[PDB]
Amino acid sequence: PKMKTHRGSAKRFKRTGSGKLKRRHGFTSHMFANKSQKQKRKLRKSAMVSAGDFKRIRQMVAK
């Protein structure tokens, strides 16, 4: 039977042109009084999935 896409990952990652996965930052809901404005600007942007993590999870989101 077809491999099943991991649906949690599909709601959180995006595939780029080159085939990398784009993601968002964690600490981006409440407890914002704690973080600095600089910290917030950075967290607000997107990130790429790390090499090691990609190796771990690439089959989960093939398709």
Binding site: H6, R12, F13, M60
Partner: protein, 144 residues
């Protein structure tokens, strides 16, 4: 049929484990010694990190899918040079020529490369640049 030689490199001999120590894949058959990964059907599920919260659960869900999303079929200019000067270019013409096979939502023209022939192109949408490049040559764009 008595001297078939398949293409060199096209076929290899499969590796059989657990057939003696000479092969180098005897006994433990490549699995090493003990633990979960040595067991039959053993192996943690795909993205499992042994109890560390998996990456996908450390990072938030984002966005939604638009029910009414419109993806267009793209036709960069360079491929319109395939047509003979004076010709008007409709969708159905781009089907017959086999430049687009499926026309999702419609045909959009984009400005990648450069056009040479005075066409009278009609597509569902146009890149500002594509419209400024068809006319630049000496052609009329109309939207359908």
């Amino acid at each position: 049929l008595h001297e078939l030689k398949p293409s060199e490199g096209s076929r290899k001999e499969r590796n059989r484990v657990g057939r003696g120590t000479g092969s180098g894949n005897g006994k433990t058959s490549g699995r090493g010694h003990k633990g979960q990964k040595a067991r039959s059907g053993g192996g943690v599920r795909l993205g499992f990190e042994g109890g560390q919260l998996p990456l996908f659960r450390r990072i938030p869900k984002r966005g939604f899918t638009n029910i009414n999303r419109k993806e267009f079929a793209i036709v960069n200019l360079d491929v319109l040079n395939r047509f003979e000067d004076g010709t008007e270019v409709t969708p159905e013409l781009l089907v017959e020529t086999g430049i687009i096979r499926n026309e999702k939502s419609g045909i959009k023209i984009l400005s990648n490369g450069n056009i040479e022939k005075k066409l009278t192109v009609k597509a569902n949408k146009f890149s500002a640049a594509a419209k400024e490049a068809i006319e630049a040559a000496g052609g009329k764009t109309e939207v359908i």
